[PDB]
Design a protein around this ligand. Structure first.
Ligand SMILES: *C(=O)[C@@H](NC(=O)/C(=N\OC(C)(C)C(=O)O)c1csc(N)n1)[C@@H]1NC(C(=O)O)=C(C[n+]2ccccc2)CS1
Length: 243
């Protein structure tokens, strides 16, 4: 099941970007590890925005929102300018608009959130006490192997949510498409005074329908482009002939 993969080459790629990281790939029930810091795969980190996928699933499942709802921008200056507008849950997914995902979390509220997170068994399922930021600062944590298992199940409509809800959240996640290969996923990035953890978790849907899921997890620095996660993921996917 969980093993290291054939690759001297991906190890290099990560050293060549001057980072410590791992790339977990899950096809059917086989999980391979690649990178220059494999032990990260079993290390817990905060999911940061990658949690937006689970938030949306819980929110939609319990009818706290719907895919047509327009979340209103009330006019205050926000941490990013691209967030400064009315938007749907789907458009928030793509922009990683935290304030939408915080409104939604509050609608959900703490008891349902923690019943649902324990029900799903996400990470260490620890939400503790603040409903509106537990995925960004802790206590909630998850490993890269757990994430890839989560997105694999989302990809395959195997999570314990309605089928329509799963399909609606999948449809929010399309990043890129070319040669008939689709790539779905979600970035994440948390700025803790310790290290900074960067995520990119999602999947490839190949032309014949086959799903190959991935969870990139690396140490970020403020000097890196945000681009670097996608660049390293796409190089590695090509090298493994997944795309
Ligand atoms: C989800 O993971 C969100 N992360 C954060 O809100 C945090 N930081 O975002 C960064 C990018 C580090 C920032 O400069 O503010 C964060 C760190 S500690 C804490 N409580 N919050 C969204 N993630 C990302 C991303 O993954 O890149 C965003 C997209 N983005 C980033 C940089 C430039 C353009 C777009 C928005 S926050």
């Amino acid at each position: 099941q969980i093993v290291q993969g054939h690759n001297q080459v991906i190890h290099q790629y990560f050293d060549e970007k001057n980072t410590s990281g791992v790339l977990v790939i899950q096809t059917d029930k086989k999980i391979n590890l690649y990178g220059n810091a494999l032990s990260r795969a079993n290390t817990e980190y905060v999911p940061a925005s990658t949690f937006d996928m689970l938030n949306a699933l819980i929110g939609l499942e319990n009818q706290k929102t719907d895919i047509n709802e327009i979340f209103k921008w009330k006019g205050e200056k926000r941490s990013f300018t691209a967030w400064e507008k009315d938007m749907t849950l789907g458009e928030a997914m793509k922009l990683s608009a935290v304030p939408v995902y915080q409104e939604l979390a509050r609608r959900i509220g703490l008891d349902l959130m923690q019943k649902e997170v324990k029900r799903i068994g996400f990470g260490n399922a620890e939400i503790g006490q603040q409903v509106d930021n537990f995925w960004l600062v802790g206590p909630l944590k998850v490993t890269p192997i757990q994430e890839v298992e989560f997105v694999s199940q989302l990809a395959h409509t195997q999570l314990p949510f309605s089928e329509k809800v799963q399909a609606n959240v999948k449809n929010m996640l399309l990043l890129e498409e070319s040669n008939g290969y689709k790539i779905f996923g979600k970035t994440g990035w948390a700025m803790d005074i310790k290290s900074q953890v960067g995520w990119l978790t999602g999947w490839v849907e190949q032309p014949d329908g086959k799903i190959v899921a991935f969870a990139l997890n690396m140490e970020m620095r403020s000097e890196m482009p945000a681009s670097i996660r996608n660049e390293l993921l796409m190089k590695s996917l090509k090298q493994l002939n997944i795309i």
